[PDB]
Design a binder for this molecule. Structure first.
Ligand SMILES: O=C(O)Cc1cc(I)c(Oc2ccc(O)c(I)c2)c(I)c1
Length: 247
């Protein structure tokens, strides 16, 4: 009765087993979104920083937390726990830059035109560029300004995160056909959650599924910026986890 409800033009809202998952998933997001005061605490980085290595510096610091937020949200999901140590790791390395991105874009203030990193620092497109990310920063900023229209909610950001995390495409995965079922499950629940929210933007699900791809790009480019970085005459200022995540 899914494809059917489609043809009759009804938009299926979540079901019992789904509103469950949605809760289980929404909670995580919220239990790791330290949220009510970022636009408040957000420290504007001195514009003379990143006009780079200095700005890179900052970023580098306040990043270990940012990676853990992803790490902790994954810990809460029983789907992510049913999987091996190995896939678990793979999965987190794969989705990490994707999640921090969302986290970065959802915190975009169209006003001062900056993104807020780690819920503390506020930087401009130029600062994030010259800091060591180049194009990716335009990709994250541009994403942000697009999401400032999707008006996502804790659930929507959360389930997004979830779809990012359960990627059966990551190289090395062992339990492939199972992470897919888990993904497939999240996607469905997302759509349904979407219908239930009934936004007023046509193609919301298609539009939104494109951000998933976009985030995957940023993610891919970021791996390429992470190589252009390791040079610069490497070593120092590269936090251990930041290094383990992306190798
Ligand atoms: O904190 C969050 O939750 C999100 C977050 C944190 C930071 I610091 C950030 O900037 C990056 C990311 C990768 C990278 O290689 C470099 I240098 C800087 C992004 I974009 C997002």
């Amino acid at each position: 009765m899914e494809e059917l409800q489609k043809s009759i033009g009804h938009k299926p809202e979540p079901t019992d087993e789904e509103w469950e998952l949605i809760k289980t998933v929404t909670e995580a997001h919220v239990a790791t979104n330290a949220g009510s005061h970022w636009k408040q605490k957000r420290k504007f980085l001195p514009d003379d920083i990143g006009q780079d290595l200095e700005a890179f510096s900052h970023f580098t610091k306040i990043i270990t937390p940012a990676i853990t937020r992803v790490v902790d949200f994954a810990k809460k999901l029983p789907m992510f726990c049913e999987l091996p140590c190995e896939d678990q790791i793979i999965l987190l390395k794969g989705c990490c830059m994707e999640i921090m991105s969302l986290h970065a874009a959802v915190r975009y203030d169209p006003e001062s035109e900056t993104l807020t990193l780690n819920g503390e620092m506020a930087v401009t497109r130029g600062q994030l560029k010259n800091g060591g990310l180049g194009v990716v920063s335009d990709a994250i900023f541009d994403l942000g300004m697009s999401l400032s229209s999707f008006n996502l909610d804790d659930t929507e950001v959360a389930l997004l995160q979830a779809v990012l995390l359960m990627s059966s495409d990551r190289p090395g995965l062992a339990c492939v056909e199972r992470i897919e079922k888990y993904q497939d499950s999240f996607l469905l629940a997302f759509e349904h959650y979407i219908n239930y929210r009934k936004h007023h933007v046509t193609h919301f699900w298609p539009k939104l599924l494109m951000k998933v791809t976009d985030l995957r790009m940023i993610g891919a480019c970021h791996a390429s910026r992470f190589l252009h970085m390791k040079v610069e005459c490497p070593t120092e200022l590269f936090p251990p986890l930041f290094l383990e995540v992306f190798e």
